[PDB]
Amino acid sequence: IPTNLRVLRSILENLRSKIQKLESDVSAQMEYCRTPCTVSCNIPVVSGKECEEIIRKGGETSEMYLIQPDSSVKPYRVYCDMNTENGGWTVIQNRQDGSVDFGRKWDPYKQGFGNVATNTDGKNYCGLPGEYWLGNDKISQLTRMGPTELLIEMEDWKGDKVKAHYGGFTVQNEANKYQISVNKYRGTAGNALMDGASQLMGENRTMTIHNGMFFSTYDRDNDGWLTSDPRKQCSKEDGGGWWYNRCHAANPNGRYYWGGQYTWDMAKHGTDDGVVWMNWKGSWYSMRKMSMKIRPFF
Amino acid sequence: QLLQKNVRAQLVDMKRLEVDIDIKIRSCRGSCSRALAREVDLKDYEDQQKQLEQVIA
Amino acid sequence: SSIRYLQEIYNSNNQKIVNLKEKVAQLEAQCQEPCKDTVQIHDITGKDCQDIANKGAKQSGLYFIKPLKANQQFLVYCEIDGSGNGWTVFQKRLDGSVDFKKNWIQYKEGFGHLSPTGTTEFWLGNEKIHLISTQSAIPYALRVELEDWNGRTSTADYAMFKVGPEADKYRLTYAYFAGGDAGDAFDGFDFGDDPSDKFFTSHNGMQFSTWDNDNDKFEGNCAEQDGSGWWMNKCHAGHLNGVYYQGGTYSKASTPNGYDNGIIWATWKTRWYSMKKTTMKIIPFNRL
């Protein structure tokens, strides 16, 4: 009681200097944002419907390409991974450094956002992927062209890695709330999408299965929770768009926590809102790398 | 007298905010000319968070 | 025992937080857009770059075109001059950044990169060259432009230029040489004593060859030997898809097979001199 005005005076004086530092940090970054970052992604001559056709046409290096899935569709940029497994992979989602905000609304997730690709060293082409989400209209159109497979890969902060391969993958259109279906699992990451979280059992595990779910963003609730209160939402402000149930065993589009480990008291709404794959690392580990890649199934 | 020891409540708000700001500044690296090189000292926050609960026992 | 609360430090911090959160929200709205890409594609489209120029496009750069018989549109670099001529560029060499030792499919479909600035190396693809140059009843012309290592440029023009279909191995054809100070390397070159060297180094009517699809007039494999795809005879006098040599000068000792495999045009420079830059581009003949 007598020794109480000592540390309690220094704790508040610590916090006020922390607010001054944050105040300065945010302000400095704001000046940097007076002008944008730039790229010069000169376009490969070789094009096709997607990245599989492109590799069949001799496009054998991983980089940005222009694809035109349909003559009715405007040609658009994508990162093609030509090296993983048999190549021909169209990247639809990528995380690697937290350089892009994935806490976005319905329209951004609909249209696509982030950086497809960036220039490497002093090259006149963009051979490195950026962080991005291709866009739900585009993802739906690609998966519905024919049987499509899905490769999800992730890496922790120690350099270990696992994968989740889904031989079958489909995304319905906006009218159908971009409903997801996955099957034919194999891999090392654990079947989070079909089986739910491996640490949960019964009802509680079942309510984490993503297969069959609709897409929701924090301004568009299509999750598993049917209760009429704003407090019960899987996607809250600055939360990722994902195929939420009640709520998730996995969220590739979660918030990028540095170093991997995070806790409830670091999270904006006290939830496990990170780049998560519970079946590998649990709810409170945020991946260092996470990506999603599709390809026509053969 | 004034037993307003709710500085443990402001300490919690600062921890969230530090992390939230760290994430938000980082998300500017893909938008803006320059990205501010910075860190978060969760160790400093928890060392003095270990206190307060210590001096109030 | 002392009695001082102060505590304005606490309330002033809460207010400093609420105002900081406002600043943080404002920074968030400034970090939503992606990096700005300097590379943009123009909106005007047409059958070729001349059609695009005719529709009022004034800027050289990247455009989609769709020849009538093409199943899909494809991207090209268009060169548009101050006189409304729209050249479709199908080959560019500039700095040796792109490997031209490519297979049949790669030469069929195209490789390298397209830039608004025309500063990148590429091969547009034989299928596309065929589609552009065989549009119904539209005579085409080819211009070859060359640059040496001392900044001098030269050209060679070929009238009624056509590239045939894959079924005829993308055969190169033209009616006649239409002039230019680079000379007519497509007519072959009288290199030495052999009375048949000029005949065997001409390029008119030659089918296209790559290492994995040999359609030349040689017992061996010209394209495999010289590391390229080209309309090989036995073997060549103009060879623009050859190996890029810095400084121009190279020799037999430079090469694995002992042959001249550089970027050559025998009527302008010795076959042991390799061009700094080349451009192969096509336009409707009536524009000339």
Side-chain angles (χ1 to χ4, degrees):
Chain A
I1 304 296
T3 319
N4 214 310
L5 283 302
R6 307 270 186 84
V7 188
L8 206 71
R9 184 187 169 269
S10 197
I11 187 97
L12 282 154
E13 282 196 326
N14 179 280
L15 290 176
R16 73 191 292 187
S17 61
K18 291 290 180 66
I19 302 157
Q20 175 61 280
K21 222 286 178 179
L22 288 171
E23 192 177 315
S24 184
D25 278 348
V26 170
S27 180
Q29 188 57 253
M30 189 72 92
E31 277 302 347
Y32 295 158
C33 297
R34 181 179 288 274
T35 50
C37 53
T38 52
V39 280
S40 303
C41 304
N42 299 308
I43 298 160
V45 169
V46 68
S47 192
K49 293 184 174 175
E50 32 57 49
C51 297
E52 163 64 18
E53 182 165 302
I54 291 183
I55 196 169
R56 283 177 20 243
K57 290 164 145 203
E60 48 182 28
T61 56
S62 289
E63 57 184 286
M64 189 200 77
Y65 292 83
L66 201 53
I67 90 267
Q68 190 176 20
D70 206 297
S71 71
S72 70
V73 177
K74 189 195 188 193
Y76 63 88
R77 296 158 181 78
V78 82
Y79 194 89
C80 297
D81 175 345
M82 298 319 201
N83 295 99
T84 307
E85 211 207 56
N86 310 329
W89 296 102
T90 308
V91 177
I92 65 167
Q93 197 266 178
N94 191 54
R95 318 288 300 275
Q96 58 195 197
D97 56 4
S99 67
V100 166
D101 185 355
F102 274 73
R104 305 210 187 206
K105 292 181 171 178
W106 185 259
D107 198 54
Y109 269 98
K110 169 186 163 78
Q111 304 303 354
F113 62 86
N115 298 299
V116 176
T118 57
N119 301 86
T120 166
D121 63 80
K123 301 286 188 156
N124 56 211
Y125 67 85
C126 295
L128 297 181
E131 289 202 339
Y132 72 104
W133 176 257
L134 184 66
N136 289 160
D137 284 346
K138 284 169 182 179
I139 292 162
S140 173
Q141 192 285 149
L142 284 170
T143 70
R144 279 180 48 87
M145 285 189 78
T148 302
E149 54 176 326
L150 168 77
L151 179 62
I152 303 176
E153 304 163 80
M154 67 206 71
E155 182 178 308
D156 72 10
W157 296 75
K158 297 312 107 185
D160 288 302
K161 36 208 177 69
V162 289
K163 68 176 190 184
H165 209 299
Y166 293 92
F169 172 59
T170 318
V171 174
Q172 306 304 322
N173 57 24
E174 202 183 9
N176 287 277
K177 295 169 289 178
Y178 304 116
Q179 201 178 183
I180 193 186
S181 63
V182 285
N183 58 56
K184 297 189 237 54
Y185 168 82
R186 67 180 194 267
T188 43
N191 196 178
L193 302 194
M194 302 176 69
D195 289 5
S198 54
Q199 51 265 63
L200 301 167
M201 315 205 107
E203 308 173 327
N204 309 306
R205 179 173 195 163
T206 298
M207 61 186 80
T208 57
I209 293 167
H210 298 283
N211 197 11
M213 294 301 106
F214 313 110
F215 203 85
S216 24
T217 56
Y218 74 88
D219 71 331
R220 189 75 65 80
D221 178 9
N222 295 314
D223 63 27
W225 285 110
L226 298 163
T227 37
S228 288
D229 58 327
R231 294 297 285 260
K232 286 278 184 297
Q233 278 182 46
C234 294
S235 191
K236 292 164 180 287
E237 184 185 273
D238 210 22
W242 192 245
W243 291 278
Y244 292 107
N245 201 337
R246 296 188 298 163
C247 280
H248 66 274
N251 194 6
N253 292 338
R255 307 231 291 157
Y256 198 87
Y257 293 95
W258 200 268
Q261 293 284 163
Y262 73 102
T263 54
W264 77 267
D265 54 307
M266 309 179 195
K268 197 168 201 178
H269 316 283
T271 58
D272 184 1
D273 65 355
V275 185
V276 166
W277 199 273
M278 289 176 195
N279 300 233
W280 186 35
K281 290 288 198 205
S283 309
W284 302 104
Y285 199 86
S286 195
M287 298 313 155
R288 170 146 182 69
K289 295 200 189 302
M290 171 76 81
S291 62
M292 303 172 64
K293 302 169 175 166
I294 92 270
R295 188 177 66 192
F297 184 85
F298 302 89
Chain B
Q1 292 174 316
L2 282 71
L3 306 165
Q4 279 165 284
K5 312 166 296 291
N6 70 151
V7 187
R8 71 166 175 86
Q10 201 189 64
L11 208 53
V12 165
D13 279 308
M14 280 302 291
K15 198 186 186 179
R16 273 194 177 91
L17 189 58
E18 194 85 33
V19 176
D20 192 59
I21 287 169
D22 195 36
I23 310 310
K24 276 151 171 187
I25 271 120
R26 198 165 288 117
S27 75
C28 292
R29 173 176 295 268
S31 288
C32 311
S33 292
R34 291 186 58 185
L36 187 81
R38 64 156 291 176
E39 290 180 317
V40 165
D41 205 356
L42 293 161
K43 293 167 188 175
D44 186 43
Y45 269 94
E46 70 178 294
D47 283 345
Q48 56 185 44
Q49 202 163 207
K50 204 181 293 297
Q51 290 176 312
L52 262 71
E53 324 299 311
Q54 187 68 38
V55 297
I56 315 302
Chain C
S1 304
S2 289
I3 35 97
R4 295 173 192 180
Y5 68 98
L6 278 74
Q7 294 315 293
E8 192 180 302
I9 296 87
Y10 171 84
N11 296 83
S12 194
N13 278 188
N14 274 165
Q15 169 67 191
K16 222 171 280 179
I17 284 167
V18 178
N19 294 148
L20 179 59
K21 289 179 169 189
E22 291 180 37
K23 218 207 297 294
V24 175
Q26 291 172 348
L27 174 75
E28 184 168 36
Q30 296 303 123
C31 299
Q32 294 301 118
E33 294 291 296
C35 296
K36 185 66 199 301
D37 191 355
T38 63
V39 177
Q40 293 168 63
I41 306 161
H42 293 96
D43 286 313
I44 302 91
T45 189
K47 312 277 184 40
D48 58 29
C49 291
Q50 188 53 57
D51 195 30
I52 284 169
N54 288 356
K55 292 177 183 169
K58 302 289 159 65
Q59 292 188 261
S60 296
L62 302 183
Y63 294 81
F64 285 110
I65 81 296
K66 196 183 173 299
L68 300 132
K69 297 196 201 98
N71 291 317
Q72 186 62 270
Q73 81 186 156
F74 53 91
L75 201 59
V76 295
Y77 177 82
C78 289
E79 188 207 315
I80 305 168
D81 69 11
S83 310
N85 305 130
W87 297 88
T88 312
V89 178
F90 75 76
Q91 190 258 30
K92 194 81 189 186
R93 306 300 291 276
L94 277 183
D95 60 11
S97 57
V98 176
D99 192 1
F100 273 70
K101 189 174 60 194
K102 296 270 152 80
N103 65 34
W104 182 259
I105 297 280
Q106 296 172 319
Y107 271 100
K108 174 184 175 162
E109 305 299 353
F111 54 90
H113 298 86
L114 301 159
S115 52
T117 51
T119 52
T120 50
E121 300 197 326
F122 68 90
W123 180 259
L124 181 62
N126 292 334
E127 181 62 21
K128 295 159 191 171
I129 326 290
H130 163 65
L131 293 165
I132 301 157
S133 74
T134 65
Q135 286 173 281
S136 53
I138 300 169
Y140 246 82
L142 159 74
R143 178 162 293 167
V144 164
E145 42 176 339
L146 314 166
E147 190 168 324
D148 71 9
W149 291 80
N150 296 295
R152 289 180 301 278
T153 63
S154 64
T155 67
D157 289 357
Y158 293 90
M160 326 292 85
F161 168 82
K162 275 180 259 303
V163 168
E166 201 184 3
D168 200 24
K169 308 289 181 175
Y170 295 122
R171 192 187 303 268
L172 172 69
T173 71
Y174 60 84
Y176 53 94
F177 174 69
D181 58 350
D184 184 11
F186 286 169
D187 203 50
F189 196 82
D190 186 359
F191 291 109
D193 191 40
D194 200 309
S196 64
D197 54 14
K198 190 188 168 84
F199 178 78
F200 278 114
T201 53
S202 60
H203 293 94
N204 202 4
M206 289 303 111
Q207 286 187 322
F208 202 86
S209 285
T210 56
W211 72 265
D212 61 337
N213 208 128
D214 176 342
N215 308 113
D216 70 32
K217 301 289 170 167
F218 181 35
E219 301 57 48
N221 198 143
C222 291
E224 194 173 65
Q225 284 182 334
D226 290 354
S228 63
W230 198 246
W231 300 276
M232 295 298 198
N233 192 156
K234 190 165 72 86
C235 289
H236 59 78
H239 188 235
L240 305 182
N241 290 349
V243 174
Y244 202 88
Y245 290 100
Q246 226 62 45
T249 309
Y250 71 109
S251 61
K252 182 163 170 180
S254 300
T255 79
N257 298 303
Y259 293 109
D260 58 312
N261 70 166
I263 304 165
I264 76 152
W265 198 259
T267 48
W268 197 43
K269 312 287 197 187
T270 186
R271 69 187 182 271
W272 298 112
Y273 187 96
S274 190
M275 301 311 142
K276 186 176 183 179
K277 310 183 184 184
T278 69
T279 307
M280 307 183 73
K281 55 180 187 183
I282 57 186
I283 197 165
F285 190 44
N286 63 215
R287 299 301 306 193
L288 271 41

